[PDB]
Symmetry: C2
Subunit: 252 residues, 2 copies
């Protein structure tokens, strides 16, 4: 199954200026992400950036790259611009791989693309991982997801979902035994035609409240397939300390 | 336009205790004033059975092993000899404030929404304390009124609002309490009990999540009049 990887790479970040160009053991972070993407089954990998300096760096190490619009209000918006410019067919599959995930396993990229292909009833496929800490469950910065028996998302929420009634009434310092809590991993495969729907709809109140763009799809009745990540997804990069962590993994 | 049977599942809370009548009697009073062709109490407790017959209600004693009102309710539909396409309305015994119009409403909604196996109802939440109260069931729906999920957790989460103040209700967010009333056909009840309990239902103690778990859709409508 063919699919295209798009890697969004935005220059500005509050706590890491020129974030995609920060060095990780001799290569800029964006190059590390692109290297991971090249290990996947992708038919094509394109960097989508909002800054000439990143475009130049990317072309400098061999990556296909283009300059987008700086003012996209969401990641899906940015993907739509790229898919449209590349002229991808509406039934083609595009996988969004964030430019600040240098440790992303290629198998996870393949996984979402494979899953979307296998689930015609869904317009989006994405991944989840087990939650092990109760504090993470009650952490609004951690996105929880619940699915049906076939893996279609019921919803995504920053709220402690599902609620363990008896367990939490008894103790909120421990994870309810046997209840498979899932944290959403923001790697997505999209059918290109969905991107056009997304842009035509615009923001909805549910999405705005949770601050979760994937709820726009759910609100409009589009289905999202969710699967347990085939292997572990290490945290991405937002801060100087994250860079240090990732450098150690890669020998720098 | 279509006929329906009301079944009230009561588990041994319903006895009673206010104001002068059982909660279950208040529910029954509401139900028999609806357009229901018949109202039956379903219980597995002989004390509850005796109490209901004691105020004039038709009551059936079900097997003790049922793990949900809907299971208990399926035994009754079977015993009443209802056709598989017959509509049953589950009015839970903990909803004494349900006016008969709501009962009529949920039955009508089921017939109007073939895309869903279950019709149910919701009302607005005006108190932030209710959001953070596990005893209050919240529901979120999509644009076509189909449930996304049901949860005792504060759903949906208003990120910016709750980061500022957990103790006031977020503006411009239509919070909904799920009303404990369902319409479904007898045929569906059979499938429901055959599914058996799932982990999601067991965790939230919300039987309707069994339907969501197995991929069927639930139509949610705002209650046509206040409780
Ligand atoms: Na009496």
């Amino acid at each position: 199954q063919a699919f295209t990887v798009v890697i969004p790479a935005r220059y500005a970040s509050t706590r890491l200026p020129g974030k995609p160009l920060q060095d990780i053991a001799g290569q800029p972070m964006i190059q590390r992400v692109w290297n991971q993407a090249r290990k996947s089954a992708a038919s094509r990998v394109v960097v989508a950036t909002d800054d000439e300096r990143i475009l130049a760096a990317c072309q400098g190490f061999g990556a296909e790259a283009l300059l987008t619009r700086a003012e996209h209000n969401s990641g899906t918006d940015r993907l739509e611009e790229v898919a449209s410019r590349l002229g991808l067919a509406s039934d083609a599959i595009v996988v969004n791989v964030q430019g600040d995930e240098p440790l992303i396993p290629p198998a996870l990229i393949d996984q979402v693309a494979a899953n979307l292909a296998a689930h015609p009833e869904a317009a989006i496929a994405t991944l989840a991982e087990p939650i092990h800490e109760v504090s993470a469950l009650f952490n609004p910065n951690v996105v929880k997801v619940a699915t049906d028996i076939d893996g279609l998302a019921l919803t995504f929420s920053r709220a402690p979902l599902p609620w363990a009634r008896d367990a939490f009434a008894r103790d909120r310092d421990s994870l309810p035994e046997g209840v498979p809590y899932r944290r959403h991993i923001g790697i997505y495969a999209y059918r290109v035609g969905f991107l056009a729907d997304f842009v035509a709809w615009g923001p909805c109140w549910l999405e705005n409240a949770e601050s979760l763009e994937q709820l726009r799809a759910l609100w409009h009745g589009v289905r999202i397939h969710v699967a347990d990540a085939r292997e572990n997804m290490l945290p991405g990069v937002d801060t100087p300390e994250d860079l240090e962590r990732v450098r150690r993994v890669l020998g720098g």
